[PDB]
Amino acid sequence: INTITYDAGNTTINKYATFMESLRNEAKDPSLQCYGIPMLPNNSSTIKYLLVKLQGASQKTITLMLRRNNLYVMGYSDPFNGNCRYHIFNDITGTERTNVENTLCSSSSSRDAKPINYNSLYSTLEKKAEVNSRSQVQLGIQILSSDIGKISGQSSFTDKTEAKFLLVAIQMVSEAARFKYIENQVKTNFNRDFSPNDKILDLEENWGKISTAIHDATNGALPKPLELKNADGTKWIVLRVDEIKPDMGLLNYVNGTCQTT
Ligand SMILES: *[C@@H]1O[C@H](CO)[C@@H](O)[C@H](O)[C@H]1NC(C)=O
């Protein structure tokens, strides 16, 4: 397993761009692409996971563990009282839950559990964060850095604080890797807090559908119109791969053959 590192507390646009490229390159199957967009591996690859080590306020760190097959965050660890403190979502099942603990903490000599007492669905995180929608949760570099400090090394924090941290980190790491559009929103707003627009949220919700549509396209034509949203919330109807391609960073794994270029 490899670790991609990113210091959100002392950074620049160009450093975040490099981080995104590194994350995409570690996540993707080296051999799979459709229409020149790299695709994630199936769930039976030899290297199943990846670590993303984030640094933030007061140089405190959190490590995210991501599944390569779909880039979902499985849990995170923080240095706490000399221990690898591992936090896993409450629906991560049996032996994979064992694997997440062992993967997060392998080089560490001591560990302690602090479970995430909920699952990773956006609806769940929004409920825990006490917001109507993650549209209401500002994103940004400084926010990410500060949120890291509210969790890492802290003996106590509320589920709300955690869920807001997770909304920010999941979108700025996994969703940004999946979507160049979302990466570009971060970079455009690099020096400020921003409210994610309707296109960010819509892309996040439709990644699977988009990945299927692109994979199953013949000579660039999507089998059915894809109903998405523009940045200002208006309806965006996509008919061909080239219309959506510039927004894509990674495709979800989809079995079968596709036009690779
Ligand atoms: C960021 O890091 C650079 C290089 O180590 C350092 O010179 C600078 O003071 C840091 N920025 C701040 C204000 O933390």
Q: Which residue has the tokens 């993707």?
A: 28
State how far the Cα of 85 lies from the Cα of 66, in Å rounded to an integer.
17
State how far the Cα of 240 lies from the Cα of 87, in Å rounded to an integer.
41
How remote is the CA of residue 58 from the centroid of ligand 1, in Å? 12
How remote is the CA of residue 148 from the centroid of ligand 1, in Å? 18
Active site residue 72: yes
Please check whether residue 39 is in contact with residue 254, taking contact to mean a CB–CB distance below 8 angstroms: yes
16: helix, strand or coil? helix
Every domain of the chain and the residues it spans? 1-177, 178-258
Tell me whether residue 135 is exposed, middle or buried, using C-beta atoms within 10 angstroms of its C-beta: 0 to 12, 13 to 18, 19 or more: middle
Please check whether residue 154 is in contact with residue 85, taking contact to mean a CB–CB distance below 8 angstroms: no
Please check whether residue 89 is in contact with residue 97, taking contact to mean a CB–CB distance below 8 angstroms: no
Q: Active-site residue among 175, 183, 204, 253?
A: 175
**Pairing assessment for the beta strands 61-67 and 73-80 based on DSSP bridges:** antiparallel
Please check whether residue 40 is in contact with residue 71, taking contact to mean a CB–CB distance below 8 angstroms: yes
Q: Minimal CA–CA distance to 92: which of 60, 113, 116?
A: 116
Q: Which residues of 248-259 are buried (b: 16+ CB within 10 A; e: fewer)?
A: bbbbbbbeeebe
Task: Tell me the technique behind this structure.
Answer: X-ray
Q: Minimal CA–CA distance to 122: which of 88, 89, 167?
A: 167
Please check whether residue 222 is in contact with residue 238, taking contact to mean a CB–CB distance below 8 angstroms: yes
Q: Active-site residue among 96, 97, 118, 122?
A: 122
Active site residue 16: no
User: Tell me, what amino acid is at 34?
Assistant: C
As its CATH architecture, domain 1-177 has 3-Layer(aba) Sandwich (3.40)
Q: Which two tokens stand for residue 25?
A: 């390159």
Resolution in A: 1.5
E strand intervals along 89-199? 111-113
Number of other residues whose CB lies within 10 A of the CB of residue 94: 7
Q: Minimal CA–CA distance to 89: which of 59, 135, 124, 62?
A: 124
Tell me the Cα Rg of the chain.
Answer: 18
Q: Which two tokens stand for residue 93?
A: 């099942």
Chosen CATH of 178-258 out of 3.90.1070.10, 3.40.50.300, 4.10.470.10, 3.40.190.10: 4.10.470.10
Active site residue 118: no
State how far the Cα of 194 lies from the Cα of 196, in Å rounded to an integer.
6
**Pairing assessment for the beta strands 221-229 and 235-240 based on DSSP bridges:** antiparallel
Phi-psi region of 156 (alpha: psi -120 to 50; beta: other; left: phi over 0): beta
Q: Which two tokens stand for residue 43?
A: 């769930």
Active site residue 96: no
How remote is the CA of residue 10 from the centroid of ligand 1, in Å? 6
- In order, the DSSP letters of 211-228 are HHHHHT-BTTEEEEEEEE
How remote is the CA of residue 1 from the centroid of ligand 1, in Å? 30
